[PDB]
């Protein structure tokens, strides 16, 4: 399984070079995301109000996507529902603050419903 | 357009996604054939980048599938090859 | 450069072979196959579009699996 | 009306978008004889002096890709080795002449090997 890697590299990489090409904003957003450690769970759905689930790695990043109950990511907007840390613990949107990032268990998980697009 | 440059990059993602061993997950790839499939049979740009928003979740999805600081750093190091 | 865009047609090329049907074809397809992986794992743009000539001649060789000319009118007609 | 044809006509519709996109000579020449009806019917090889046979349609085409021995072909240097007419029977190159041409079974197949 030597040479398949070298095949499956080069197909990643080409495929990369196609969406940087692209330079679609909402692609771009959810490439950029991933690489700082902000990756979905499940697939970013299309219908207005599903289900996503997406970790959100650091407090830089949350504050760069969240805003009140507002979740933006892949040009969308997204109404969070439900914030857990890495112990499963549901986090209350008031406990997110600049003070109080480091008592928080980082990553985050978010939960949020499509909506505005 | 870049109408065609979408669609060509959605049969190289779901290629990607072929050789990442995903059929064996019947509904993932039941799932990704149907968004490859709109992705291709779309008729404005909308709804090519918008079912490649999600088609591309799938890999980003995918815990250490692809190493994208990996795979970034090879790029930044080719450097046009 | 252009060598990239050699190598992602080459994985469009070979996905349309598979829709169709040359898989049943051990024989040609391990030939498609080994092509495809030569592009994507090429040196430079000579080795990559003389192996993307042999791997689309595969397409051009098969009679009807194209009609070069009716894809070619969709393509006029549509631009 | 299947799906799945039209995502075949749709991915081979794009195909061509990013054949006809890449401008290449050696592609560009395969594809227009295709056009033509000179289409191969075996994987053109990359090896020097190994065969290849195409369909040549008609005495316009043939003239534009062969001189005396030479098949010219996908930017390449082919030497004719047979010819076949339509019935199977060998044709003598030099038979294949402007003078002769009608009263020959079109179409032809050349088998060459690559000089390169």
Sequence with gaps: ???????????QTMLFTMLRKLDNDALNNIINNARDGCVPLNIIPLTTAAKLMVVIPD?????????????????????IQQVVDADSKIVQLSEISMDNSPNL??????????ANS | ????????????????????????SSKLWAQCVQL??????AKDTTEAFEKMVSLLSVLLSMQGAVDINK???????????
């Design chain 1, 1 to 11: 399984e030597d040479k398949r890697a070298k095949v499956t590299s080069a197909m």
């Design chain 1, 59 to 79: 407090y830089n990043t949350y504050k760069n996507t969240c805003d009140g109950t507002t979740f933006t990511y892949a040009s969308a907007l997204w109404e």
């Design chain 1, 105 to 114: 268990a980082w990553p985050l998980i978010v939960t949020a419903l499509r």
């Design chain 2, 1 to 24: 357009s870049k109408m065609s440059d979408v669609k060509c990059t959605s049969v190289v993602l779901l290629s990607v996604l072929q050789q990442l061993r995903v059929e064996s």
């Design chain 2, 36 to 41: 490859h499939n709109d992705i291709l049979l």
């Design chain 2, 71 to 81: 795979l970034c750093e090879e790029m930044l190091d080719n450097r046009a090859t």
